[PDB]
Amino acid sequence: RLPHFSFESLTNMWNAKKSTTELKTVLNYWLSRAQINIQLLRKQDYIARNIEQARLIGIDFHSVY
Amino acid sequence: HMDALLTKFNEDRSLQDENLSQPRTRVRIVDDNLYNKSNPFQLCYKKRSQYYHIYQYRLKTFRERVLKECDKRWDAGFTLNGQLVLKKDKVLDIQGNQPCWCVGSIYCEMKYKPNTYGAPDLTKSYTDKEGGSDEIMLEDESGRVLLVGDFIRSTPFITGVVVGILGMEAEAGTFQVLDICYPTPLPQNPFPAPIATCPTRGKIALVSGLNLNNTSPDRLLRLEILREFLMGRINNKIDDISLIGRLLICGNSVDFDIKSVNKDELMISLTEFSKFLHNILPSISVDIMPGTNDPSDKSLPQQPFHKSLFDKSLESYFNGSNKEILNLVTNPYEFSYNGVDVLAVSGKNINDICKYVIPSNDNDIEHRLDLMECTMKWQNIAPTAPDTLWCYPYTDKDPFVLDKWPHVYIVANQPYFGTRVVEIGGKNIKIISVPEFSSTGMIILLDLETLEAETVKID
Amino acid sequence: SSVHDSLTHLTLEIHANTRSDKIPDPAIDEVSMIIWCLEEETFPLDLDIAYEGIMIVHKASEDSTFPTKIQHCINEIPVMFYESEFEMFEALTDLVLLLDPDILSGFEIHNFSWGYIIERCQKIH
Amino acid sequence: NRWVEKWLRVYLKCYINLILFYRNVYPPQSFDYTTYQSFNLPQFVPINRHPALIDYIEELILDVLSKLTHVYRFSICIINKKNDLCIEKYVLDFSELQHVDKDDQIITETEVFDEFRSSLNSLIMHLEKLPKVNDDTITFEAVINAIELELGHKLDRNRRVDSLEEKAEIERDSNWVKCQEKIKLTSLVGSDVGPLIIHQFSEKL
């Protein structure tokens, strides 16, 4: 489970000289979203339903989705 | 047996040569603390998201506090071959190869070895290996720097510790640890000696909290059977009564767990606490404080709960006597015997650091004894949920671990007994770690004759 | 792998320094810090790849210690120091010419994504 | 009244579960000495928690207290697995009760708890003073020697039932069966508080 931050709160933790920790969390938080996006589409949409369908069918990747 | 023969042998004390309808009153106790001050830790009568503003308040308050001491109380810049020790805290100019006084606060490793909606154990995989490594990071809120050296593990400056570090720089990232800084001493509250007609003053920090679940009789045992009579009927013939003063519990008034308790089992243990306290109140006056597992705010400034610890027999005494024989005091309190100021802590404030939230800073009584030495020295944020109030948490007068220093700090509920004394440049401070009562008691006399403590094994 | 099967994938996400009364509007607001993530064994080379990287936009006022905070406290990558926001966008496109972005990963793929900076650079830049 | 059968419920909880503890019909490591099982106990009585079993015990006590004037003598019967023969018959009494009179006076909470603590400690005393051989293979069952009862026909006569209180009451008359109706008998000190005369003895085989 990933915590979600509102964009106004993210704006509060961006843009100004507050502490190191809020820069750390906005950076590591959007990186955590990026890494779970990579793991998530690595687990379900790429391998399980799409890419072996491309190697079986023959048509390229875009029109399958 | 021959145990009875020992009583047969000891016929010298027929009645101890006491009248025994004469009570020999022992203590002329002063207790200057009770009436003519506000207690800072105590609540606000008008009062009767929070933590965030408090953390910057501690950081700024310490920042001007120790800003007065980087060259006044520490190293002259004429040394180090004129390496500049000027008061630059930010890491932008720490990268200058002259070592400055890096006034910052260590937040290197503080998370939990024991524990799922938020998926904690998957996050805790990062906790275990990285936290186990003892490496220390210093944060002035402008940037982390690496720390190595001998004092990494020997001196337990775990968290919230504003220090100025001195080492040969040799890299922008890291230092060694040769020196640390401290807050300035708020000054010597005068320790008196009443030299003319010395009272042989009372000497007590006895109870760490009579931890009393209804679920066990063994914790009920060693209270009301050996105690309440060591204060008055069980006799060291007769000097134990002369040493003993006014009763001091510290936290842990009734042990219970919050998710398993209801109304009437709370009053069962509270009325048996009332039995104990109304039993001992004719003999020895008492000062009572809640704060870890007895009912509380579960904070260091915690409102002490009157009128609930007592039955109707004992309820009318606090109405009758305002603060003399018993008063409700908080988890910290400055008990002052005309300037013998002593501080109390129920123990949770250091026990969470000592067992619950510690993956690092470890080179077990002689280790954990010095954690509250550290927490005394920096006067800092020990716990994980401090000051925990919806209205008026800290109004720039009342730090939970305060700024005025005592002569003895009381902390409680350790595995073993520990009692040393250390002298600092400000004052002298005796270390008091009174153990939890199910861990064999080790119940203690405190102070105030030649500033000396005496434990006794209650098991 | 021994042969590259298909479709190395890298995401792109943003920060919004929005007006704090309203939802972020990319026709109004910018992005200072860009986060792309490729981490798998599908890409063979693994020199600077299968390895996350983040880059900045700042106004060249280094005195507010934004670069030095990130590089010392956080040890992910040497963080690229970019300015002049269109040039940072250009260096992002240079990076996706360097790498192999076959699948263009993301989330809210018209709104909080590649498409955010595409119509942002269409209307503002 | 209301408070007096609460005291009877706690006293029978202590009596029953203490007989269960000292006969080792349940393992002693499940028992722990305590004061709170849903109420305030007079003594620290070893109670295993086991919520099916404590549900059974407060069930049986709420069954016995439901009649409250037919019963002149509650008792506990002890039966082996080996034979149905009575090993012990612990005597209790509901004689000259306050509740039948419904007298408001007198509460005497500390005094009634004092005499209850006395009768409990007597039960402790004459439950250690018989020895421990064949400490397993013992069971439990109830018996009531009552002066004037029969309720078990209330299941019959084509009754139509609508409320949960009398659902409970039909469970009370359903759970109780009249049996068909000496070797040794030992003395026990009973409580002799005024409104609650509990003249409690013991029987052996």
Short mmCIF file of C-alpha atoms in Angstrom, two decimals, chain D residues 9-193:
data_model
loop_
_atom_site.label_atom_id
_atom_site.label_comp_id
_atom_site.label_asym_id
_atom_site.label_seq_id
_atom_site.Cartn_x
_atom_site.Cartn_y
_atom_site.Cartn_z
CA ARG D 9 -23.88 -15.42 40.14
CA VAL D 10 -20.35 -14.45 41.19
CA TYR D 11 -20.42 -16.85 44.17
CA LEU D 12 -21.56 -19.74 41.97
CA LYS D 13 -18.96 -18.78 39.33
CA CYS D 14 -16.25 -18.98 41.99
CA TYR D 15 -17.68 -22.20 43.47
CA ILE D 16 -18.20 -24.04 40.17
CA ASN D 17 -14.98 -23.01 38.43
CA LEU D 18 -12.94 -23.59 41.59
CA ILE D 19 -14.31 -27.15 41.82
CA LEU D 20 -13.36 -27.45 38.14
CA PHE D 21 -9.84 -26.23 38.96
CA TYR D 22 -9.15 -28.45 41.97
CA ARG D 23 -10.48 -31.62 40.33
CA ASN D 24 -8.15 -31.07 37.32
CA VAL D 25 -10.99 -31.63 34.87
CA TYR D 26 -9.32 -28.93 32.72
CA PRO D 27 -5.52 -28.43 32.49
CA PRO D 28 -4.14 -26.12 35.20
CA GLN D 29 -2.00 -24.13 32.76
CA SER D 30 -5.17 -22.75 31.18
CA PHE D 31 -6.27 -21.49 34.60
CA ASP D 32 -4.98 -18.21 35.99
CA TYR D 33 -5.96 -16.51 39.24
CA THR D 34 -8.16 -13.50 38.56
CA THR D 35 -10.87 -11.16 39.78
CA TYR D 36 -12.68 -10.28 36.53
CA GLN D 37 -14.84 -12.67 34.60
CA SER D 38 -17.60 -10.21 33.58
CA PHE D 39 -17.95 -9.01 37.24
CA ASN D 40 -16.02 -8.50 40.49
CA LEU D 41 -14.84 -11.68 42.21
CA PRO D 42 -14.37 -11.84 46.00
CA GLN D 43 -11.16 -13.89 45.85
CA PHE D 44 -8.55 -14.61 43.23
CA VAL D 45 -10.19 -17.71 41.73
CA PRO D 46 -8.24 -19.80 39.15
CA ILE D 47 -10.28 -19.39 35.96
CA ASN D 48 -9.50 -20.74 32.52
CA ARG D 49 -10.69 -18.33 29.87
CA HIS D 50 -11.86 -20.73 27.05
CA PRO D 51 -14.94 -18.75 25.94
CA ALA D 52 -17.05 -21.81 25.08
CA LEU D 53 -16.45 -23.13 28.60
CA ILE D 54 -17.05 -19.85 30.42
CA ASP D 55 -20.14 -19.42 28.21
CA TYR D 56 -21.26 -22.83 29.50
CA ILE D 57 -20.57 -21.87 33.12
CA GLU D 58 -22.43 -18.54 33.07
CA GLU D 59 -25.13 -20.34 31.06
CA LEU D 60 -25.59 -22.93 33.84
CA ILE D 61 -25.57 -20.24 36.54
CA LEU D 62 -28.14 -18.14 34.67
CA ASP D 63 -30.18 -21.35 34.37
CA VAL D 64 -30.07 -22.04 38.13
CA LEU D 65 -30.75 -18.41 39.09
CA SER D 66 -33.74 -18.32 36.70
CA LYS D 67 -35.92 -20.37 39.06
CA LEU D 68 -34.55 -19.01 42.35
CA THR D 69 -37.29 -20.30 44.68
CA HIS D 70 -37.72 -23.94 43.67
CA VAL D 71 -34.03 -24.53 44.42
CA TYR D 72 -33.24 -25.08 48.07
CA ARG D 73 -29.91 -26.74 47.23
CA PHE D 74 -27.73 -26.22 44.21
CA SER D 75 -24.95 -28.79 43.98
CA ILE D 76 -22.05 -29.95 41.82
CA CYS D 77 -21.77 -33.62 40.90
CA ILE D 78 -18.47 -35.29 40.01
CA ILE D 79 -18.52 -38.20 37.56
CA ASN D 80 -15.58 -40.21 36.26
CA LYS D 81 -15.23 -41.23 32.64
CA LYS D 82 -14.81 -44.77 34.01
CA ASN D 83 -18.16 -44.93 35.80
CA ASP D 84 -21.26 -42.76 36.18
CA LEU D 85 -20.94 -43.17 39.98
CA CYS D 86 -20.65 -39.94 41.97
CA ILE D 87 -17.09 -39.18 43.09
CA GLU D 88 -17.95 -36.02 45.01
CA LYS D 89 -21.16 -34.05 45.56
CA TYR D 90 -20.35 -30.50 46.64
CA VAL D 91 -23.31 -29.02 48.51
CA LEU D 92 -24.55 -25.44 48.17
CA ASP D 93 -27.74 -23.79 49.40
CA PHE D 94 -30.28 -21.19 48.30
CA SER D 95 -32.09 -21.29 51.64
CA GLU D 96 -33.86 -18.25 53.19
CA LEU D 97 -32.90 -16.06 50.22
CA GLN D 98 -33.32 -12.30 50.09
CA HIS D 99 -34.60 -12.55 46.49
CA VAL D 100 -37.68 -14.65 47.35
CA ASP D 101 -38.52 -12.06 50.01
CA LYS D 102 -37.36 -9.22 47.66
CA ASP D 103 -36.25 -7.30 50.75
CA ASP D 104 -34.33 -4.12 49.90
CA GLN D 105 -32.35 -4.22 53.15
CA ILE D 106 -29.53 -4.88 53.72
CA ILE D 107 -26.76 -4.46 51.13
CA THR D 108 -23.65 -5.00 53.40
CA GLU D 109 -21.34 -5.35 50.39
CA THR D 110 -18.09 -5.74 52.33
CA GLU D 111 -19.74 -8.05 54.88
CA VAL D 112 -21.34 -10.34 52.29
CA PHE D 113 -18.07 -10.37 50.33
CA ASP D 114 -16.31 -11.21 53.63
CA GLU D 115 -18.50 -14.25 54.27
CA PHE D 116 -18.17 -15.23 50.60
CA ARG D 117 -14.37 -15.02 50.88
CA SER D 118 -14.59 -17.24 53.96
CA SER D 119 -16.69 -19.89 52.20
CA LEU D 120 -14.37 -19.79 49.15
CA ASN D 121 -11.29 -20.20 51.32
CA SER D 122 -12.94 -23.15 53.10
CA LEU D 123 -13.60 -24.64 49.65
CA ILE D 124 -9.88 -24.15 48.89
CA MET D 125 -8.91 -25.84 52.18
CA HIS D 126 -11.02 -28.96 51.84
CA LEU D 127 -10.11 -29.14 48.16
CA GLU D 128 -6.39 -29.40 48.82
CA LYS D 129 -6.76 -31.66 51.85
CA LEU D 130 -7.98 -34.56 49.78
CA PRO D 131 -5.03 -36.04 47.82
CA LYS D 132 -4.11 -36.11 44.12
CA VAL D 133 -4.09 -39.63 42.72
CA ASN D 134 -5.56 -40.29 39.25
CA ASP D 135 -5.51 -36.55 38.62
CA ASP D 136 -6.80 -36.87 35.06
CA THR D 137 -9.92 -38.79 33.90
CA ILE D 138 -12.52 -36.78 35.85
CA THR D 139 -15.56 -34.91 34.47
CA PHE D 140 -18.28 -32.47 35.52
CA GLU D 141 -22.08 -32.43 35.71
CA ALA D 142 -24.67 -30.48 37.66
CA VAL D 143 -27.35 -31.62 40.09
CA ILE D 144 -30.04 -29.65 41.95
CA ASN D 145 -31.89 -31.03 44.96
CA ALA D 146 -34.88 -28.69 44.84
CA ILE D 147 -38.00 -28.59 46.98
CA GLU D 148 -40.86 -28.04 44.47
CA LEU D 149 -40.20 -27.95 40.73
CA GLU D 150 -41.27 -29.22 37.41
CA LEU D 151 -40.80 -26.94 34.41
CA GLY D 152 -39.83 -29.31 31.55
CA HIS D 153 -43.40 -29.65 30.21
CA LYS D 154 -43.37 -25.99 29.11
CA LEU D 155 -41.85 -27.07 25.78
CA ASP D 156 -45.12 -28.97 25.18
CA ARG D 157 -48.85 -28.02 25.00
CA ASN D 158 -48.63 -26.38 21.51
CA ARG D 159 -47.30 -23.08 22.83
CA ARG D 160 -46.55 -20.22 20.41
CA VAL D 161 -43.43 -18.30 21.42
CA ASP D 162 -42.59 -14.70 20.50
CA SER D 163 -40.02 -13.07 22.84
CA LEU D 164 -36.31 -13.77 23.39
CA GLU D 165 -36.68 -13.70 27.20
CA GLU D 166 -39.07 -16.61 27.08
CA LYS D 167 -36.88 -18.20 24.37
CA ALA D 168 -34.25 -18.23 27.11
CA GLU D 169 -36.87 -19.52 29.59
CA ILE D 170 -37.79 -22.44 27.31
CA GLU D 171 -34.05 -23.15 27.06
CA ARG D 172 -34.00 -23.16 30.91
CA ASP D 173 -36.76 -25.75 31.18
CA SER D 174 -35.34 -27.70 28.22
CA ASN D 175 -31.85 -28.07 29.68
CA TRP D 176 -32.97 -29.67 32.97
CA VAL D 177 -33.94 -33.34 33.40
CA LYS D 178 -35.06 -35.15 36.55
CA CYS D 179 -32.82 -38.12 37.36
CA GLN D 180 -33.82 -41.37 39.13
CA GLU D 181 -33.97 -39.80 42.61
CA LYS D 182 -23.98 -41.64 51.09
CA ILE D 183 -20.63 -43.40 51.53
CA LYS D 184 -18.68 -40.50 53.05
CA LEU D 185 -19.54 -36.88 53.80
CA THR D 186 -17.17 -34.12 54.91
CA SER D 187 -17.86 -30.77 56.55
CA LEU D 188 -17.41 -27.38 54.92
CA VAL D 189 -17.71 -23.96 56.54
CA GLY D 190 -20.55 -22.04 54.93
CA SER D 191 -21.26 -18.35 54.67
CA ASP D 192 -23.49 -17.14 57.51
CA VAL D 193 -24.38 -13.65 56.33
#
